[PDB]
Design an enzyme around this catalytic site. Structure first.
Site, PDB file in Angstrom:
ATOM      1  N   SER A  44       0.804  -1.256   0.000  1.00 32.34           N
ATOM      2  CA  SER A  44       0.000   0.000   0.000  1.00 32.34           C
ATOM      3  C   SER A  44       0.829   1.295   0.000  1.00 32.34           C
ATOM      4  O   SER A  44       0.322   2.346  -0.416  1.00 32.34           O
ATOM      5  CB  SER A  44      -1.003   0.025   1.180  1.00 32.34           C
ATOM      6  N   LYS A  47       0.873   4.111  -2.428  1.00 32.80           N
ATOM      7  CA  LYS A  47      -0.049   5.263  -2.317  1.00 32.80           C
ATOM      8  C   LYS A  47       0.547   6.558  -1.877  1.00 32.80           C
ATOM      9  O   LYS A  47      -0.117   7.588  -2.071  1.00 32.80           O
ATOM     10  CB  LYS A  47      -1.247   4.983  -1.401  1.00 32.80           C
ATOM     11  N   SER A 110      -7.017   5.192   2.907  1.00 27.62           N
ATOM     12  CA  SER A 110      -6.171   4.400   2.008  1.00 27.62           C
ATOM     13  C   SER A 110      -7.026   3.797   0.891  1.00 27.62           C
ATOM     14  O   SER A 110      -6.915   2.621   0.592  1.00 27.62           O
ATOM     15  CB  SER A 110      -5.357   3.315   2.762  1.00 27.62           C
ATOM     16  N   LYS A 213       2.261   6.471   6.950  1.00 29.72           N
ATOM     17  CA  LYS A 213       1.527   5.297   6.571  1.00 29.72           C
ATOM     18  C   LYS A 213       2.196   3.999   7.063  1.00 29.72           C
ATOM     19  O   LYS A 213       3.430   3.875   7.109  1.00 29.72           O
ATOM     20  CB  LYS A 213       1.362   5.252   5.041  1.00 29.72           C
TER      21      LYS A 213
END
Length: 318
Positions: A44, A47, A110, A213
């Site tokens: 992820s 991102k 997210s 994150k």
């Protein structure tokens, strides 16, 4: 302010993870690091780059955060197997949403759906957005970094490094001011559903973390990007491949705590009795009492000492 090796740097703490980077914001100086260039799937964390393209689209005036975007069936999780199980803003086809509220869905939720909708709006399509993601890794010199998809899902080719993500994170913090601030928002309500920012470190009652994150890479451990302020100074801790989610929280805050207590970032140069340059440096706190500095232009040079060791050197003017 925003801009080789730290003299007399105390011993680093042992770090339980695959890779790590603790970096200074002002200067980009690495305070400590292990296995920082190893190519690892970011999952992820891709991102961060996705948000960065959005930031840069706002900064060049090609888009505006008030722009009203229409969600195609592209950006709708119903019927898209790519999405099920993943994190969502829960957008529906025909929804008309601001760039701002899509940026919040990306950051706070997210939201994989939000990535697609921003991508179509920004580049005209998914693959052209990845072209831009790769262009901004190349401009920023992310030499270990390559993307395939706008959200990090269904992308076995994608890769980065602890170091590259430290560098990308510093560029993010240094972009549009109100973009970065969305990393600190604790919640987003969208279309009747409220969801929590997944970065646990935001609620830490011993630091000012407005961090980035957290994530996980199937069969390669747990990852994190935090960033903490203390007064007029900011650190960036990247951790990658920690045993467990609890590990990466403790390893990331072990790094940032060791950063915060043992080092300072100082203004060495400015405008006076000695330069034309302003110059900033990361030094151990114990070293502050031991630093000494030994027509329009001029012809000498300044030789900066820590104790009896020269560290850096620049010309001498007027």
């Amino acid at each position: 302010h925003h801009s080789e090796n730290i003299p007399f740097s105390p011993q680093p703490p042992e770090i339980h993870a695959g890779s790590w980077v603790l970096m200074d914001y002002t200067t980009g100086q690495i305070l400590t690091a292990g296995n920082e260039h190893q190519q690892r799937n970011p999952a992820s964390l891709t991102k961060l780059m996705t948000g960065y393209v959005v930031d840069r689209a706002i900064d060049s005036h090609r888009i505006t955060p008030d722009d009203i975007v229409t969600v195609g069936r592209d950006a709708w999780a119903k019927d898209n197997p790519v999405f099920v199980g993943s994190s969502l803003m829960f957008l529906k086809e025909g929804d008309r949403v601001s760039v701002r509220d899509l940026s919040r869905g990306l950051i706070v939720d997210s939201g994989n759906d939000a990535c697609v909708a921003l991508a179509d709006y920004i580049a005209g399509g998914q693959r052209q957005f990845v072209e831009m993601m790769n262009n901004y890794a190349e401009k920023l010199h992310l030499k270990d970094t390559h993307f395939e998809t706008v959200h990090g899902l269904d992308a076995p080719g994608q890769h980065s490094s602890a170091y590259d993500l430290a560098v990308l994170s510093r560029a993010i913090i240094h972009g549009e001011p109100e973009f970065y601030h969305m990393y600190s928002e604790k919640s987003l309500t969208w279309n009747g559903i409220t969801q929590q920012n997944r970065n646990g470190l935001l609620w830490d009652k011993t630091m000012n973390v407005d961090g980035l994150k957290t994530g996980h890479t199937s069969g390669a451990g747990f990852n994190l990007i935090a960033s903490a302020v203390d007064g007029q100074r900011r650190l960036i801790a990247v951790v990658m491949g920690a045993d467990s989610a609890k590990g990466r929280e403790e390893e990331a805050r072990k790094l940032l705590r060791w950063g915060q207590q043992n080092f300072t970032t100082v203004q060495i140069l400015h405008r006076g009795k000695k330069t034309e340059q302003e110059f900033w440096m990361v030094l151990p706190k114990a070293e502050i009492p031991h630093i000494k500095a030994k027509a329009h232009q001029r012809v000498g040079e300044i030789e900066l000492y820590d104790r009896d060791k020269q560290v850096a050197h620049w010309p001498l003017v007027t």
